[PDB]
Amino acid sequence: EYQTFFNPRTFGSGEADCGLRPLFEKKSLEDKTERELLESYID
Amino acid sequence: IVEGSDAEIGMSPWQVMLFRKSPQELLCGASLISDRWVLTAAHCLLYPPWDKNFTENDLLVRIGKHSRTRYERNIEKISMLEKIYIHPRYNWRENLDRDIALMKLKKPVAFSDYIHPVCLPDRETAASLLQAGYKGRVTGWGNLKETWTANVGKGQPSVLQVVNLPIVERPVCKDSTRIRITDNMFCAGYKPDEGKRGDAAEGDSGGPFVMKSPFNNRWYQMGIVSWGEGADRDGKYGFYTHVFRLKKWIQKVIDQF
Ligand SMILES: *C[C@@](*)(O)[C@H](CCCNC(N)=[NH2+])NC(=O)[C@@H]1CCCN1C(=O)[C@H](N)Cc1ccccc1
Ligand SMILES: *[C@@H]1O[C@H](CO)[C@@H](O)[C@H](O)[C@H]1NC(C)=O
Ligand SMILES: [Zn+2]
Ligand SMILES: [Zn+2]
Ligand SMILES: [Zn+2]
Q: Which residues pair with B84 in a beta bridge?
A: B103
Kind and range of the H or E element at A11?
A: helix A8-11
Rounded-to-integer distance, Cα B15 and Cα B166, Å: 21
Other Cβ atoms closer than 10 A to A9 = 7
Resolution number, Å: 1.8
Residues of chain B contacting residue A17, judged by C-beta atoms under 8 Å apart: 111, 116-117
Rounded-to-integer distance, Cα A43 and Cα B194, Å: 14
Sheet holding B219-227, edge to edge: B5-6, B161-166, B135-140, B208-212, B219-227, B238-242, B185-188
Residue A6's identity, in one-letter code, is F
Residue B60's identity, in one-letter code, is L
Report the b/e string of B103-117 with b at 16+ CB within 10 A: bbbeeebebebbbbb
What are the residue ranges of CATH 2.40.10.10 in chain B? 1-12+118-244, 13-117+245-257
Architecture of domain B13-117+245-257: Beta Barrel (2.40)
Structural domains of chain A, with CATH: 1-43 (4.10.140.10)
Which residues have CB less than 5 Å away from ligand 5 (the ion)? B 66, 72, 75
Rounded-to-integer distance, Cα B83 and Cα B105, Å: 7
Residue B177's identity, in one-letter code, is T
| Whether residue B205 lies in the annotated active site | yes
Do the Cβ atoms of B219 and A14 come within 8 Å?
A: no
CATH of domain B1-12+118-244: 2.40.10.10
| Whether residue B79 lies in the annotated active site | no
Atom of ligand 2 nearest to the CA of B92: 14
Residue B55's identity, in one-letter code, is T
